[PDB]
Amino acid sequence: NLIEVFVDGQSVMVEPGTTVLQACEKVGMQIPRFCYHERLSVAGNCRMCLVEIEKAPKVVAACAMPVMKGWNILTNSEKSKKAREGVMEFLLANHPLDCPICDQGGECDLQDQSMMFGNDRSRFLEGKRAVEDKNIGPLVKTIMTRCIQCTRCIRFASEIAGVDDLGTTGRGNDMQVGTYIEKMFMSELSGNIIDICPVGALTSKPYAFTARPWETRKTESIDVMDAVG
Amino acid sequence: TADPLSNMVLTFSTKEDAVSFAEKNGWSYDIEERKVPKPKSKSYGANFSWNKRTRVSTK
Amino acid sequence: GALFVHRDTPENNPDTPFDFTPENYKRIEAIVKNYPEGHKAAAVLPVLDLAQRQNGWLPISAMNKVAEVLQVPPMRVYEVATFYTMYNRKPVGKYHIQVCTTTPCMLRNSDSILEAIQKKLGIKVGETTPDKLFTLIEVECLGACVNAPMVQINDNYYEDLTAKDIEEIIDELKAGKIPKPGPRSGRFSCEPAGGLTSLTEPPKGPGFGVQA
Amino acid sequence: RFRGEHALRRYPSGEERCIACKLCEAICPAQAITIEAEPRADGSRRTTRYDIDMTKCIYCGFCQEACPVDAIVEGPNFEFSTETHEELLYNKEKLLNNGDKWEAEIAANIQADYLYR
Amino acid sequence: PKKTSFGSLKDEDRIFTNLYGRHDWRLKGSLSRGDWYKTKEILLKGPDWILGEIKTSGLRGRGGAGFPTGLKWSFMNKPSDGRPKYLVVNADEGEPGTCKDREILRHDPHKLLEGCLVGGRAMGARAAYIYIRGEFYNEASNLQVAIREAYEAGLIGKNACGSGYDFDVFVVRGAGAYICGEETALIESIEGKQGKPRLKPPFPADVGVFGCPTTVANVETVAVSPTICRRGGTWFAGFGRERNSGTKLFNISGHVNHPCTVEEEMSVPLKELIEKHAGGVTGGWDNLLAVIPGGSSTPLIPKSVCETVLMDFDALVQAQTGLGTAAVIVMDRSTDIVKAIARLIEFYKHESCGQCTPCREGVDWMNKVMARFVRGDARPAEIDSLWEISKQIEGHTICALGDGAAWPVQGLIRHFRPELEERMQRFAQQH
Amino acid sequence: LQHHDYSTYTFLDLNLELSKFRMPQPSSGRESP
Ligand SMILES: Cc1cc2nc3c(=O)[nH]c(=O)nc-3n(C[C@H](O)[C@H](O)[C@H](O)COP(=O)(O)O)c2cc1C
Ligand code: SF4
Ligand code: SF4
Ligand code: SF4
Ligand code: SF4
């Protein structure tokens, strides 16, 4: 039934259709990512997914290209690494120098994957851009500057929230996902966007500055605020 | 802090392993299940199509 | 033009009323007739032209109005009005000069066309004149590269302008409607005056096409 | 270079340098430091209770190096033995005072040393 | 032809008379040309032999892609799947160095219309969608008029000039979207979606506008196609080198005595049309050192390799140059080049939207780097670092705008490196 | 003289005139979001 495709060496009974992402993630190998999300929707922007197929003339988008038989995927192969280096050199080419004041800066995914990949030294020599702040709610402060044109948040917002106030604005340099007009975004699941932000762009106001992730214990249970349990 | 032992933490290769430790050591325990997320079918075009009412919008 | 956000709410268009003419309703409905019934959205881009065609500028009232028209969320109209530069979100003068300075014209010293326009008007290029008429601006390649510098004034293509010819254009702008050709040096229909080689035979009869 | 009594210190403007980045809390090998960062009414990140006890400080002087904003400084002073244990468990307050008395000196030494780091 | 001899071309070899506007662009002028010839009879209710006529035509992409249009159009022999099929025509004409698609629409809509009819039939298309620039308003009205003349004659509309194959064109316009010059960006433009191109796990052939399957082609290919289907496409295949079968518009431009557009045999030497149709550059051909093939996108050509190259794109590929719709911008030596290429990359930065990060950031960055270069402030080694940036842009960017964004400065490095260093030394001497 | 010298409103009107010539648009299927 299932199509066969090779992870680096091992043959894999991968599902018909399905992305290279889920293929590598079946053997447990894990592709670097940002804009993609596991229960959202694929988007081609921010190509951190780049990998070369064994016979590939040039690298494919692992989070998106459907698997098919006869392919082989050396995730550890050098060219893929050059690709990821290509992503990280660029994301940081204009990122704000504010890890320390970032509420996400103690745990930002951009950091972990900055450690996993990208040259240790940078070669900036000019003047980075920085957008103005853009309030969209009392309980969800948005520093911006930090958002990486990754569009996971609009695909959350426009869809599951059902509200569409959020979205892209402009093109070329100084393009921004800052929502049009002053009006606040509002939703009954307004807060979840905070979680979904890869960086510190969407830091919650009430929790702001309060703490740093490593210090915290993570005691588990269930809420009773909803009957949803 | 009250209880001295409170910061203890212990990795295990398997569940029966941890159960075996709490049994060897005499403490009571509560087993909990693994939570691998269920697989989700996904495709680039699934976002589109006029009929499927996925559509999304501008991109 | 960094003000993509429109965070500002100028009294010029906070909730200032605006409405299309009935003819415009007929036109946009005709556009709905141009496109499949399941998606009104194909019509979004054209309506914004018409909304501006009535004005030469797009108030936010026009934006949420059009959003009401095609029954789609306003953010669509915002994103599309924004992404596409030809729409003008700042009110303009009677003319919208948009001279190219792109390299094919830059070699043709289009920049001289620019200093000519400035020295004539005294405008700092992009600023609106107090006169509320001229609105000079540099623009990327309009795709008439083969000829010369061009000054597309409100879709009035002009080419081969000399600074004196620019004197003629600007003075004529106050004088009346302008002829709207290709090259102004004397050539027309892109045809070089130096040889006019290429095609040479007039006929092109419906022949040779027999194949079988 | 010499390491000694700690002191928080200000901007030339007279604002405190501290931003509560709380990595100096992540480094103090004896974990003497304790920090509760909270928002300013002005909105800026600010410690509400920075504190350190010299009883557990090992004067490795990591924090002098670790701070991104160069907030806390291991000052010149060394002579400050006390009659009682309590006088050792410093609040942010005492540290600020220490940065007050020695700021000329501290800034002077940093003026001597800063290239090496 | 088969020989090294080139620069030859019969006027009646041209598919395109009234290229320059003479002899009436009005439909009556098309009739004087007898353009509707056997156009009704081409519709024998089965593609194949016309589609094969184009496969045998040797014809390839006129979008600058150079991709075999017969095979490209072969894709929609497929069953319609119950979703209506459409043909989208690329008329963006926003690309630099390119005035070729302008005068043709201004002076010969009709052959293109017959191309929409024949090629639209080949696709089994329900319609014939056609994009227009917002810069192109007046011209959109001219074409709308000629299309209305096509309606009144019944040559289009229901059944369309007999045969019984229903055929309605649909004129479409945009606004400032140069990126819609990319095909899928334009396909995105049709839904009212912003013109940021799709990644393609599915090809446009598989899914088109509104989810209903579609297709695209450049104006040149689709306009030549009906004549391919009438006059033998093998006759089209005879010109130039075999892979470079047919003819191509040659837009000589920039510093030259007589800049012009001239459709011509694919494989004329590049210097020839300069010495002929262009009339030669001012100060003579000897002044030339940098003249670029392609629409201000493909890498620069030095005069030494320039003498040898034939206008057909394969000769350009041996010159390490892409087709680029074979636009030609001459650049006289007296002017600085680095300012020009910097202006070009600036042209990219203004127009690259910025969906996938690597190209957005890559151009936003490489531009500023170029500003540092042109100002001369830059260190000599820095340019090599720009090359690295280029390497991270090319195969990574989701679309080819970044490729042409990268290439010209790659050429400026590769040839004008000593020139760069020479420029930097002068800034070094000011102190 | 010029091939083009049109009114600002002209295009949509020329568009509307040919609307009678249009074959009906597909309803596709789903219509209301
Ligand atoms: C007028 C025009 C402008 C184009 N602009 C671009 C562009 O900016 N970037 C790009 O990658 N492709 C561009 N293309 C090529 C498209 O990506 C597409 O492949 C092409 O239009 C189809 O060529 P064909 O019709 O010869 O198959 C352009 C094509 C045309 C006709
Ligand atoms: S977002 Fe992640 S990376 Fe950017 S600043 Fe906050 S922490 Fe440092
Ligand atoms: S919030 Fe800012 S950063 Fe997080 S996804 Fe939306 S845009 Fe990218
Ligand atoms: S030094 Fe100031 S800023 Fe650095 S961690 Fe200790 S408190 Fe936070
Ligand atoms: S002095 Fe040495 S030990 Fe005490 S805090 Fe600063 S670094 Fe940690």
Ligand code: SF4
């Ligand atoms: S790659 Fe850069 S330019 Fe090509 S489409 Fe994606 S964003 Fe626009």
Ligand code: FES
């Ligand atoms: S992982 Fe989502 S596109 Fe790279």
Ligand code: FES
């Ligand atoms: S190059 Fe400036 S308009 Fe074509």
